[PDB]
Short mmCIF file of N, CA and C in Angstrom, two decimals:
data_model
loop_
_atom_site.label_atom_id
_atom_site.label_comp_id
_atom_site.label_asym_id
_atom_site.label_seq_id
_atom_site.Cartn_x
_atom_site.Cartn_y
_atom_site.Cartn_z
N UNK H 1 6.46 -18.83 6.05
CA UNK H 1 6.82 -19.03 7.46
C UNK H 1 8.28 -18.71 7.74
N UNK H 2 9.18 -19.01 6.59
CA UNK H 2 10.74 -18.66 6.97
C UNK H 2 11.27 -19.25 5.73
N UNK H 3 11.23 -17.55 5.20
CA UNK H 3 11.64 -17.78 3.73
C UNK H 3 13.04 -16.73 3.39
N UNK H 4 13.05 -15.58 4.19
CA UNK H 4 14.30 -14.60 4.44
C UNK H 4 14.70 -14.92 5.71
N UNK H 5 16.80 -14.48 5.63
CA UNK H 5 17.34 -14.78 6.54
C UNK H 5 18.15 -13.83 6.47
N UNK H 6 18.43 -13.07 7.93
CA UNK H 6 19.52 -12.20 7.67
C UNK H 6 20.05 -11.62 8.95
N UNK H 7 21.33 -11.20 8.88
CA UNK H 7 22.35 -10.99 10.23
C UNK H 7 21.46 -9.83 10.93
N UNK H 8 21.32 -8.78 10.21
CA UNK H 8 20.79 -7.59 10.73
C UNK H 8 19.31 -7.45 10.89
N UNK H 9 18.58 -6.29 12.20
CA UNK H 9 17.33 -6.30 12.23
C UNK H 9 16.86 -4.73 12.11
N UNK H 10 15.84 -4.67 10.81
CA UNK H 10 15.91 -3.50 10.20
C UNK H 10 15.01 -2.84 11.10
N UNK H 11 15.69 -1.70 11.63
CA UNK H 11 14.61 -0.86 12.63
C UNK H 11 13.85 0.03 11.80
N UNK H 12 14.40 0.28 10.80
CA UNK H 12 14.10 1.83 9.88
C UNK H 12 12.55 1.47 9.38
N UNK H 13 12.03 3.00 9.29
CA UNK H 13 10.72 2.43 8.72
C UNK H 13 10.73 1.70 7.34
N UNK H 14 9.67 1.11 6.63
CA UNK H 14 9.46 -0.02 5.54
C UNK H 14 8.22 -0.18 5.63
N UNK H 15 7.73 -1.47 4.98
CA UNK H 15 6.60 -1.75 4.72
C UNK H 15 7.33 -3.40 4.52
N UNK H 16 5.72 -4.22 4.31
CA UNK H 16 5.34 -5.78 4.13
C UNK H 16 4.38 -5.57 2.59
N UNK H 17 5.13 -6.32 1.39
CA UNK H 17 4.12 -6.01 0.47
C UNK H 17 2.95 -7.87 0.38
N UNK H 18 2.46 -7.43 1.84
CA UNK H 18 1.81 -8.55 1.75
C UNK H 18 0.00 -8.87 1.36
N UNK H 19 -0.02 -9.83 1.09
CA UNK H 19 -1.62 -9.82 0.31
C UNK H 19 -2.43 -10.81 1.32
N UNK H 20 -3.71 -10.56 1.46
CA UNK H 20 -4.36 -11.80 2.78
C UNK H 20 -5.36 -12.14 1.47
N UNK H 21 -6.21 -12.86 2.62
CA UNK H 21 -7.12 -13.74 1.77
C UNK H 21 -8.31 -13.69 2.54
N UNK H 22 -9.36 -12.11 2.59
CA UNK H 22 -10.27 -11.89 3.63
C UNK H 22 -11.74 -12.39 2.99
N UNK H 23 -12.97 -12.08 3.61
CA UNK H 23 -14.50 -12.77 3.40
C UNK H 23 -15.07 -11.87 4.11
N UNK H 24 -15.91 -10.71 3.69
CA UNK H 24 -17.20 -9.82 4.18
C UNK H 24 -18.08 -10.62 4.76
N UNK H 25 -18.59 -10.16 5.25
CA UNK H 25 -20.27 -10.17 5.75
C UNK H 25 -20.79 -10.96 4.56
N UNK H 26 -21.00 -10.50 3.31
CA UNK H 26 -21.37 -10.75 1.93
C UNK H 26 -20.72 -11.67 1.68
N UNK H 27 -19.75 -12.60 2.22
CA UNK H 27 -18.96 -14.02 2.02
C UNK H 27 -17.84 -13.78 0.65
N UNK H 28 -17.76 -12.66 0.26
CA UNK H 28 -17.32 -11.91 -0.99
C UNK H 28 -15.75 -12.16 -0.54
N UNK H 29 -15.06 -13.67 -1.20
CA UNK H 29 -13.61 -13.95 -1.31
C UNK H 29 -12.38 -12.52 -2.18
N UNK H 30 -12.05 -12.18 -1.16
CA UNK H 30 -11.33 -10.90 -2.14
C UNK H 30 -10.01 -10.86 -1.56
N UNK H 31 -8.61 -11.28 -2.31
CA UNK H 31 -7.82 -10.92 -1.70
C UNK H 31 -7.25 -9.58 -2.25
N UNK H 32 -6.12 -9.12 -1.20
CA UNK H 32 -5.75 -7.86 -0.83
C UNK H 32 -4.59 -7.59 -0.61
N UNK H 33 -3.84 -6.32 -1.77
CA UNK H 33 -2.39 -6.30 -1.11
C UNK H 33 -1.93 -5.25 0.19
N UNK H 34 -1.68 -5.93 0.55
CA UNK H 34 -1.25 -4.42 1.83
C UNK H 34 0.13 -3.94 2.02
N UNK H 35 0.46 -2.99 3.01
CA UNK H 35 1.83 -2.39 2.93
C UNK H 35 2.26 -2.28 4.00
N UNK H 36 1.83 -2.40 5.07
CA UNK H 36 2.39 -1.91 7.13
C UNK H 36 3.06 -1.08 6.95
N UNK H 37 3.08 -0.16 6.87
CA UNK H 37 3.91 0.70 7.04
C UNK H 37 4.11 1.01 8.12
N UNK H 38 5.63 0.55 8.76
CA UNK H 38 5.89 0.27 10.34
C UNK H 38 7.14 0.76 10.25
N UNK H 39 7.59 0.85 11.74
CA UNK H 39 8.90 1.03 12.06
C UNK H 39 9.02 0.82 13.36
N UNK H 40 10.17 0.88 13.90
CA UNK H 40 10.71 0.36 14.88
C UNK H 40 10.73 1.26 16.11
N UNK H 41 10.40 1.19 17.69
CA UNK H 41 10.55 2.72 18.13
C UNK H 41 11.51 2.07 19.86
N UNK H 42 11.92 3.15 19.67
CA UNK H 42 13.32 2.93 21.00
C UNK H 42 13.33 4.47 21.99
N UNK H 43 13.08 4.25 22.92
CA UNK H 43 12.28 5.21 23.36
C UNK H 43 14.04 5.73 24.26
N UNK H 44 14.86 4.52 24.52
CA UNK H 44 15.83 4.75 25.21
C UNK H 44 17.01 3.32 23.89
N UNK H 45 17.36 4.21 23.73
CA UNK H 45 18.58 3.58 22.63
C UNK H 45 19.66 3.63 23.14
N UNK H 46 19.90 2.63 24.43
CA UNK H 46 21.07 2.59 25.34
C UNK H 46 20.84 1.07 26.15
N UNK H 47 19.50 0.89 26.70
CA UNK H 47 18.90 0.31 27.84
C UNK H 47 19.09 -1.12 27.20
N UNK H 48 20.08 -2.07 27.73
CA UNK H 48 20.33 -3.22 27.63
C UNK H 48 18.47 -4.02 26.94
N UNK H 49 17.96 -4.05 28.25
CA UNK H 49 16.71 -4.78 28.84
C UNK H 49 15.68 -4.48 27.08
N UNK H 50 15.28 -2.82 27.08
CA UNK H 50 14.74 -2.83 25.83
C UNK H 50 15.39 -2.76 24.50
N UNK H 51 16.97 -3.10 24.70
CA UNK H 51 17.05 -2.70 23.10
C UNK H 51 17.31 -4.19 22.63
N UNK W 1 -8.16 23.38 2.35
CA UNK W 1 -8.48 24.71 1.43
C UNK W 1 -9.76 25.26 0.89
N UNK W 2 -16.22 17.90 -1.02
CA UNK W 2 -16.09 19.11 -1.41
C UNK W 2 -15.14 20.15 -1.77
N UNK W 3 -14.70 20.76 -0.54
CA UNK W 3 -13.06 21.55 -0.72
C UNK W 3 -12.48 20.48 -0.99
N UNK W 4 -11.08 21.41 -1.39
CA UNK W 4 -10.01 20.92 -2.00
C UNK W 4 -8.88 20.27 -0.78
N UNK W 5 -8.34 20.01 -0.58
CA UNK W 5 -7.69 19.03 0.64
C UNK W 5 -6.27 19.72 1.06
N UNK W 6 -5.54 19.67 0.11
CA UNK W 6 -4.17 20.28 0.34
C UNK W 6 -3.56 20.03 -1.26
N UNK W 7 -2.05 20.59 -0.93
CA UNK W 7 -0.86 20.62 -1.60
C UNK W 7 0.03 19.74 -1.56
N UNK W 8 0.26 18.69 -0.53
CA UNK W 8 0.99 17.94 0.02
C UNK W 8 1.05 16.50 0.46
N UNK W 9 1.76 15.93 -0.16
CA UNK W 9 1.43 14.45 0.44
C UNK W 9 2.59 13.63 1.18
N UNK W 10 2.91 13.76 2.00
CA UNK W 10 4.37 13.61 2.72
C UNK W 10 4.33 12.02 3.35
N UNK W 11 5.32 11.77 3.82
CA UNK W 11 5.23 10.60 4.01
C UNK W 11 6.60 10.81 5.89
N UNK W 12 6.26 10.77 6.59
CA UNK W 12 7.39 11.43 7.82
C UNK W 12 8.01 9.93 8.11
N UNK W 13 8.10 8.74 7.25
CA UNK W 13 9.20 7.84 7.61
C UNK W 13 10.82 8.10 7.07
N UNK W 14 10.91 8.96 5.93
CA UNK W 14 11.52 9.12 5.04
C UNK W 14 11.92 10.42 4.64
N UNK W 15 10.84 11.28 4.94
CA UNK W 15 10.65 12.52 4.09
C UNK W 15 10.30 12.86 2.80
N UNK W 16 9.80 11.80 2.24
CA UNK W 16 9.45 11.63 1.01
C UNK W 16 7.85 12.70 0.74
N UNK W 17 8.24 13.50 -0.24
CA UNK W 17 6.85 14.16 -0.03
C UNK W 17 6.38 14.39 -1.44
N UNK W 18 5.39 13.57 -1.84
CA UNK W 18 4.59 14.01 -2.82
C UNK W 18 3.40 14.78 -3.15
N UNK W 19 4.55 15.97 -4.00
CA UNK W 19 3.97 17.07 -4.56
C UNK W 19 2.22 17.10 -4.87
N UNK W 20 2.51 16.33 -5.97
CA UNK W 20 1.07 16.00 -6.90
C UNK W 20 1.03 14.96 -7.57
N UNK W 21 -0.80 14.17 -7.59
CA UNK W 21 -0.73 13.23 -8.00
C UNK W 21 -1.14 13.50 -9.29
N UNK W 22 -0.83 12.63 -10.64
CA UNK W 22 -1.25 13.02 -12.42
C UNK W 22 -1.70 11.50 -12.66
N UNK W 23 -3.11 11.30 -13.22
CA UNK W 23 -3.28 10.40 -13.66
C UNK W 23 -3.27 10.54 -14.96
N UNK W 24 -3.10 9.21 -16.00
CA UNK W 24 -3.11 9.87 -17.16
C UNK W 24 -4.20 9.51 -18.35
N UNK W 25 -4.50 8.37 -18.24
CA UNK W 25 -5.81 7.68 -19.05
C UNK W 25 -6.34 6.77 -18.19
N UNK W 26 -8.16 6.40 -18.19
CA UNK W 26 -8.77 5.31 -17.74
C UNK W 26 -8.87 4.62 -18.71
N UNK W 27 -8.18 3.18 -18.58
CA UNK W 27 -7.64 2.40 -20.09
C UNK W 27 -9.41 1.27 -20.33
N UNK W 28 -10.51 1.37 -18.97
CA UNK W 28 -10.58 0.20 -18.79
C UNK W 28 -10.29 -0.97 -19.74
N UNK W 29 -10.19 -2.37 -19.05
CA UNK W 29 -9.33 -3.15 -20.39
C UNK W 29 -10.13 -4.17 -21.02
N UNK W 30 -11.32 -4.13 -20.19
CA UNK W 30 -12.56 -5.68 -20.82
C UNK W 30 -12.94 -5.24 -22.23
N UNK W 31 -12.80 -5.96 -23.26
CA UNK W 31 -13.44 -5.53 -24.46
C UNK W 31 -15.24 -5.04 -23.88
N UNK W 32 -16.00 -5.32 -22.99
CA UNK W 32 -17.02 -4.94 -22.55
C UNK W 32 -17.21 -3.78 -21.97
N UNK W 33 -16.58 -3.28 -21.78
CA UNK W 33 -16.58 -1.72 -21.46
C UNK W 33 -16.60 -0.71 -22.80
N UNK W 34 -15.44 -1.55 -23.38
CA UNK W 34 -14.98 -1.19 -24.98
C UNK W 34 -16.62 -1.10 -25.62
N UNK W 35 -16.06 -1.56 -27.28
CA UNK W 35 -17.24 -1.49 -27.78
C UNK W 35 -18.87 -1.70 -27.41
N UNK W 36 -18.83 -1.35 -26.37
CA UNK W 36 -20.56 -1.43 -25.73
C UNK W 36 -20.55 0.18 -24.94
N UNK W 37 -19.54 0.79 -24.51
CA UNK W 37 -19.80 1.90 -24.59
C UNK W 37 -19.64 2.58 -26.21
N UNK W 38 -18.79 2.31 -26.74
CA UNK W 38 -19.29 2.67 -28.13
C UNK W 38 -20.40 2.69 -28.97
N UNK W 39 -21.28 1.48 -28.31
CA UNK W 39 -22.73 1.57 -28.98
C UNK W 39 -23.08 3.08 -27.90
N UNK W 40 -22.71 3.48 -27.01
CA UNK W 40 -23.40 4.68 -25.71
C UNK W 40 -22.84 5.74 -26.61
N UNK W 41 -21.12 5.72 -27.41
CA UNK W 41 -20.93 6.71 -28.39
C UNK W 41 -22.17 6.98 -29.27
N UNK W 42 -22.34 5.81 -30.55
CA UNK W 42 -23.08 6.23 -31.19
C UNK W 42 -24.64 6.92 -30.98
#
């Protein structure tokens, strides 16, 4: 829930090396690592309101 | 290029682009795979 802390907010792309804990149809407990591979998008990198 | 797919595996957050993938052995690791395909050897 709030385990990192830090001054800066990373816009650049990255990833989450995070794992869930999902259940099929088949009730089949399988967890899973995943990656988001996300990034940040600023369509106007000036504009008070959205940045 | 069934068919073959491409040359390229890029990644456009970074530019990171991988060439080609090399695997190098299927280790599986259960002794049950092991010697019980070995009885499938003999």
């Amino acid at each position: 829930p709030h385990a990192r802390r830090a001054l800066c907010l990373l816009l650049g792309p990255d990833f989450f090396t995070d794992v869930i804990t999902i259940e099929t149809a088949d009730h089949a407990r399988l967890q899973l690592q995943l990656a988001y591979n996300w990034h940040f998008e600023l369509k106007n990198r000036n504009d008070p309101a959205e940045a | 290029s069934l068919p073959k797919a491409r040359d390229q595996a890029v990644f456009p957050q970074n530019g990171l682009v991988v060439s080609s993938v090399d695997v190098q052995s299927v280790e599986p690791v259960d002794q049950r795979t092991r010697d019980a395909l070995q009885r499938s050897v003999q």
